[PDB]
Amino acid sequence: YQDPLTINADLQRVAEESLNAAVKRVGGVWGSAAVLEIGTGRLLALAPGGTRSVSAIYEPGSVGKLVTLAAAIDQKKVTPTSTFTVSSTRDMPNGERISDDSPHETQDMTVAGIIAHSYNTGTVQIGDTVSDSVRYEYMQKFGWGAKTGITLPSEESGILRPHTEWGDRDHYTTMFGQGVAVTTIQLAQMVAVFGQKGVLIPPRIIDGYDDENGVYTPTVMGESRQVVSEDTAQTVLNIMQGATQPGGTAEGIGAVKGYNVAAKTGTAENVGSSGSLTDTAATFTALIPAENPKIAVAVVIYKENGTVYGSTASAPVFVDIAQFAMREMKIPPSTVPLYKYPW
Numbered sequence: 480y481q482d483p484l485t486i487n488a489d490l491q492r493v494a495e496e497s498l499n500a501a502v503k504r505v506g507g508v509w510g511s512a513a514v515l516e517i518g519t520g521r522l523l524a525l526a527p528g529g530t531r532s533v534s535a536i537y538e539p540g541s542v543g544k545l546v547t548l549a550a551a552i553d554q555k556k557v558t559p560t561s562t563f564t565v566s567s568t569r570d571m572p573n574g575e576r577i578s579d580d581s582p583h584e585t586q587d588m589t590v591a592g593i594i595a596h597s598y599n600t601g602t603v604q605i606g607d608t609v610s611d612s613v614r615y616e617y618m619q620k621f622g623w624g625a626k627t628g629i630t631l632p633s634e635e636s637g638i639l640r641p642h643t644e645w646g647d648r649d650h651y652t653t654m655f656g657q658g659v660a661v662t663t664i665q666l667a668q669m670v671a672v673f674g675q676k677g678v679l680i681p682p683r684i685i686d687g688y689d690d691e692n693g694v695y696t697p698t699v700m701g702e703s704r705q706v707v708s709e710d711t712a713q714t715v716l717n718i719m720q721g722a723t724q725p726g727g728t729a730e731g732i733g734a735v736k737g738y739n740v741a742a743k744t745g746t747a748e749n750v751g752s753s754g755s756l757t758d759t760a761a762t763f764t765a766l767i768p769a770e771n772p773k774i775a776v777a778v779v780i781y782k783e784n785g786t787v788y789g790s791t792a793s794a795p796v797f798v799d800i801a802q803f804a805m806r807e808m809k810i811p812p813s814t815v816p817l818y819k820y821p822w
């Protein structure tokens with residue numbers, strides 16, 4: 480007997496424990512977390528025990544900025560040190576007003592720092608350097624709007640409306656993960672690209688089988704794709720290491736002692752039972768150790784009639800999971816510094 484599934488039992492336990500505790504700590508309704516082994520697509524942990532991580536869809540928020548960032552970089556429209564002006568609000572060519580989470584002093588900042596702070600006013604300028612059809616194409620390549628094809632029941636495909644349907648609001652909201660709906664597994668599969676030299680590897684819960692007596696491992700199916708170039712992947716991976724740097728959205732709370740973390744936070748309004756934007760999903764997508772990623776993690780906590788933030792709600796779950804996984808996988812602490820671009 481060989482265990483044919485990919486789940487790590489102890490990691491799964493840590494995942495469920497942390498997630499349950501955080502959903503309660505924060506007064507959420509539910510949560511989800513997915514842990515992928517980098518390079519293999521092997522699913523190390525999936526919480527909760529339902530098919531929630533596979534069937535629940537929500538607007539992911541600013542974790543979706545990674546797609547926008549990767550599109551602009553891959554199309555060679557901006558570099559990590561390209562500067563844009565950030566301000567409390569910004570009025571766009573099309574008449575839309577974009578605002579940052581909280582008012583702050585107007586300043587110039589690099590692309591790297593814009594992502595670290597997650598300034599929407601800076602992000603929309605990064606996104607405007609590329610057309611809607613191109614961004615939409617990168618969204619599909621990243622796996623949005625499609626089932627990941629994992630062999631579990633009830634997987635949802637999510638909602639990615641054709642860009643031909645995007646109005647003036649959508650043009651911008653889709654840049655920061657609003658006006659699209661994803662699953663937690665889609666989030667993990669997506670962030671893993673940046674630790675896989677731009678390659679998306681479809682997630683798997685079933686290893687092979689021995690096939691010594693009876694060939695039971697699937698013929699063919701699978702297939703990974705190059706979403707983004709190797710250089711684009713490395714660059715986003717470098718930029719993501721700004722998350723736990725001072726001023727980064729994940730500072731302190733997303734840090735895993737002794738390991739370099741690459742991360743993005745998100746906080747997105749979601750539609751409540753009432754039919755209005757009463758709810759929020761707090762998201763966190765991460766890669767660790769950043770210098771040479773071994774796992775990709777996505778966490779969502781959902782709260783009805785309230786605000787939860789990716790950093791304060793979801794990052795602590797990532798931390799508990801990542802801390803165990805590094806021991807469990809016997810990964811030594813980071814010997815190189817956390818990457819920093821000028822901001």
Ligand SMILES: CC1(C)S[C@H]([C@@H](C=O)NC(=O)[C@H](N)c2ccc(O)cc2)N[C@H]1C(=O)O
Nearest residue numbers: 540541542580597655728744745746747789
């Ligand atoms: C709260 C933020 C710093 S703003 C920005 C964006 C994407 O998630 N979120 C929003 O613009 C969202 N509409 C929102 C929700 C509640 C807020 O207080 C502010 C912004 N990234 C966030 C993050 O990193 O968690």
